[PDB]
């Protein structure tokens, strides 16, 4: 007997397309069975439904396409915490974060560095709750690349995260993977897939980490990037490349990457290539905004001039991409439960999207971030997956509405209510899984 | 800012050790219990200063389980292989649900005797997740071929993972198990658990009917056990010994262990020694009851005769210890969130304790399970820690009351409400720690 | 897990760098710290410092209020401290013991250390022993200040 | 408020171009604000200046483009000392040397094998003082190449300096790096960059170390050299190749190296290629002159005939390159503080440069030795970096003047006085950095 739910919505924002007024959506089990006006609901669903809801606003579950599932101890400020934090600690903390994510209406996360694969196992077996997690496993980085931990000596880092020297201790299963050369880079992609990675993430440029670090310089050889793409492609994954400078951008594109993060020196030429080749643009503006808000407290003069110059360029890149009509999704490079909603604000107020386009970037477009691993989702349409949220207030009038989680009243993931009136912390029909 | 004062009026107040009060009250000031007595006798200064009051039918200490395992294993492998194969990030996620669930049942303290308690407590203490006070062993210490060893795997894989030689990348020395052979190795074995923040040390000092294995045989030499005790003693920990057969029991005692689990072949002589030396007896009857309920489906005839013979001994041992007035606490050898309350039932219905003695075993006596690492707790007394719970029903009339978590209405840990009317899933004044 | 250990790093990285097992390229046995557990290991631990030309041997013999860690708890067994002293003595070095709590102080004395740093819980009994045995007291007050 | 300094010079040698008489130079903060006649100083600088100086001779800070930051114990005569000397000893000794360097007016060193990267950290944080250090990190050598330590067995050498088998002990951070094959050679370049290398150095020929050693034989395959260049290029470094025989020279060129050391068998064909391709020629004549001055004390007959034959060829190569107008810089292959000034003498007396061209080789041309990592420096021009020295005597009349450090009276590096009247050992406004 199919489990049928009718949701009446004052305003239904489908994700890609004009919003409906006085609308309804029907869920049958895990998929969306009908979307249209309240008047036009098929009668069979009025007969069969076991529960109905009436809400002011309905839309897709939100995506953040750039998360990091790290759960680090607070102690170390830099990347050292990734190595030093025991993963049991990380996992505990990530459980709070995925819970918190779901409460804000985030029904999908694309983890680009960390334990998403390992934590999703506890989501899927029902022990904890969270968004659909598409994880990269470890980010791939060359030695001396953006993923490397420069503050530690090299042996400690490659001992922990290299693709040679297999050993006891969850080898090949950390937030980071360092590989140099075509040979090593095959095992690097293979090890992430081994964990159940649903996307592959490369560092393909520097990232203004130090003063001797240069975001303009590309990372990995073209030979390595090509092979990394091919390896992912063979398992029906795509590669997402961290890129700032144009050299790194161009190399990631040339190699076959279908998603780019930051893309800070993107210009006309990059925008056209991305449209021509169907490459997702994930600006990750929140990261720039963090160090703009620090304002150069304890930074040297010219190192603050360098961040602003990058920030400005990153802004023009994003604005130009939006205007040029490059396909865009949203991400923030935060921990699960972090301030993902901020990126909608920046998409509008910095990028210059309309609130409607911003929602499209966080919904209908966002599954492109995992290519062929995406189900039909991120949209309120017949046949798509029932990842649906309801709000008290109209976010087309104020995009900052998303930043009050009290404002998300109902959350459905796969047709199952995880938040809503009279519904417990672990979702409907939740049982203690240890009894 | 002044002290945070709370008055709790109780129809029945069960202090933990001693006669229960009727029409009683308890005052919390910040983290400690400021007053216990009759409602009539509340000091007037607290009536003046209190910011919140409550009235409940039954009030008692937060409950302890003194034998938990913080493993969070994937379901896949049925034996100890899961401890090795399960990535600790998965384990940690799952353990977060379990500690939440533990708190909701009024369990405010757990003594983890094998697993990631140390690592998970970090995320409890920094506020990221919520849970009981966790006093952890780190890894259980076992000899090669001992009860902690994973016989199904070859020896190199096991000692590679869990031995105290051959330091390497991969969270060396920080798993559920530690294998050490010889006086030299067992020093580093204890030291490695303390390194993680272990608040007790756990040894396997006998076999455990795992194969057609002998629970009557002792494990570790006296030389190793002596050193293990001494190492723990120097850091003000005690050692808790897994023992079945009398030879293992006697050796653990002789060495200086102050807590024994199972104690299945305990007789007159053992009871008197335990009283004479102040050694805690933790029967862990729930473990026996599990395989009694399986009833020998797919076990050979004589291997089922062996389990019953052990179960019968274990029963006589426990009964005799209770009658002999050995000091007793309760544990179950379950995962966090598991059916810890069942052990109160077995304490009464198997052990022959009164419901009042059973409560004493799970409260006033339980901190003895960590010796000098215990604060003044497990009792409703002035100066003791505010770990307090309230129930709707009188458990002295039906000890099974504890098995319905709906029946625990209020939970305070360290003076803070984690469960109660109008109180959210993560406790009072909870904030999303990732914003 | 002693006062010299780097708790923030995992144990394998620390003993890889500073343990007295597993000799390897990379100036093995020649860092700021040496971690050794058991009588056997502590012999090589002293010997490795002498190899470099050490003119004194330094032990951590108590905790040091680094975390919410106890300075009252002793570190190393008496068995290890005795051997450490003897090893130094054979090459005509003395041992200097980091000690706070009285248990650590007393154990360093009993073992044969002739110099104590901090000595924070020294009382009447410790003073008399130090005089009786000719043991240097190095308060290191600047650290407290 | 900009810090302005006026220096009046009887003779101002700018570095590339005709020397001025009765001249002046203005420093504003870190850059050179004006160069021209005393008469023509802009009036704003006469108004704003806080200090003035009058000196007979002013010129750029000198470069040595071929130094080795080794600091070896005296004990081992060969390369064994590099492995056996503890780096703390090396660092101490290198601090004296960098101090001593600065006192002789050497404001930049290009370290081609050793700890320049590690020591520059203590220069840049202000703990010690020294020249601007552009370091290679380790010199890259093939197994059995010029960097290998033939006197030790192979395992010890590759254990210490190979790019496999990461381990504790500052792996990947020594004076030498041995790599065989395209794969390994990617990690080899990457590991130097990890340390902050600002140039990459390869051994691309033999070096008359033994009698079975042949300087005519090339080292590394073309495949490896190409990849090494490409790796460096991607991070905006160039590669400097140690070459003697024409085969090694031609291969280094073909690969894309932009600096060659020794170049002992350079002929017409090499000179033209170097000019056509903008490849720096660093003769390192001092090294040849050392073993000419030994004169074959305890060497076999034909092994002394071999050194002289090389020495003669090296001479003709250098002389021909100068006459052919190849671009040339100076280096000596010494420890910091060594006799760098000797190379100016040999540039004139052996090479046949004019004293003026010799100065050009040690100043205006020398930054070419680090390609794109060079700031605008080595010249007394507006906008260039304030690395400036003053002498008591005119070195165009006697180039050996540089070999008396008493003769360098003032040293500015980055606009800061490190030597000069009434100025302390650690430079102006020096503070004890440990208070």
From Swiss-Prot, chain B:
Regarding pH, the record states: Optimum pH is 6.
Q: Which GO terms describe its molecular function?
A: carboxypeptidase activity; hydrolase activity, acting on carbon-nitrogen (but not peptide) bonds; metal ion binding; metallopeptidase activity
Q: Which domain of life does the UniProt lineage start with?
A: Eukaryota
Q: Which UniProt keywords apply?
A: Carboxypeptidase, Hydrolase, Metal-binding, Metalloprotease, Protease, Secreted, Zinc
Q: Which reaction does it catalyse?
A: ochratoxin A + H2O = ochratoxin alpha + L-phenylalanine
Residues annotated as the enzyme's active site: 202, 333
Which InterPro entries does the record match to this protein? Amidohydro-rel, Metal-dep_hydrolase_composite, Metal_Hydrolase, Metallo-dep_Hydrolase
Summarize the temperature dependence annotation: Optimum temperature is 66 degrees Celsius.
What subcellular compartments does it reside in?
Secreted
Q: What's one GO-annotated cellular component?
A: extracellular region
Q: Keyword Phosphoprotein: yes or no?
A: no
Q: How is it used?
A: Detoxification of contaminated food is a challenging health issue and ochratoxinase is a promising enzyme that hydrolyzes ochrtoxin A, a mycotoxin demonstrated to have nephrotoxic, immunotoxic, genotoxic, neurotoxic, and teratogenic properties; and that occurs in a wide range of agricultural products.
Q: Where does Zn(2+) 1 bind?
A: 67, 69, 202
Domain comment, in the record's words? Each subunit of the homooctameric enzyme folds into a two-domain structure characteristic of a metal dependent amidohydrolase, with a twisted TIM (triosephosphateisomerase)-barrel and a smaller beta-sandwich domain.
What is the similarity comment for this entry? Answer: Belongs to the metallo-dependent hydrolases superfamily. Ochratoxinase amidase 2 family.
Q: Which PANTHER family match?
A: ALPHA-D-RIBOSE 1-METHYLPHOSPHONATE 5-TRIPHOSPHATE DIPHOSPHATASE (PTHR43135:SF3)
The task this protein performs is described as: Carboxypeptidase that catalyzes the release of a C-terminal amino acid with specific catalytic activity for aromatic amino acids such as phenylalanine. Is able to degrade ochratoxin A, one of the five major mycotoxins most harmful to humans and animals that is produced by Aspergillus and Penicillium species and occurs in a wide range of agricultural products.
Q: Share what the entry says about its subunit structure, partners included.
A: Homooctamer.
Identify this protein by name: Ochratoxinase
UniProtKB/Swiss-Prot annotation, chain C:
Q: How is it used?
A: Detoxification of contaminated food is a challenging health issue and ochratoxinase is a promising enzyme that hydrolyzes ochrtoxin A, a mycotoxin demonstrated to have nephrotoxic, immunotoxic, genotoxic, neurotoxic, and teratogenic properties; and that occurs in a wide range of agricultural products.
Active site as annotated? 58
GO BP, one example? ochratoxin A catabolic process
User: Which domain of life does this protein belong to?
Assistant: Eukaryota
User: Any idea which positions bind Zn(2+) 1?
Assistant: 58
Per the record, the similarity remark reads: Belongs to the metallo-dependent hydrolases superfamily. Ochratoxinase amidase 2 family.
Q: What does this protein do?
A: Carboxypeptidase that catalyzes the release of a C-terminal amino acid with specific catalytic activity for aromatic amino acids such as phenylalanine. Is able to degrade ochratoxin A, one of the five major mycotoxins most harmful to humans and animals that is produced by Aspergillus and Penicillium species and occurs in a wide range of agricultural products.
> Which named protein is this?
Ochratoxinase
Organism listed in the record: Aspergillus niger (strain ATCC MYA-4892 / CBS 513.88 / FGSC A1513)
Q: Which residues of the full protein are shown?
A: 189 to 334 of 480
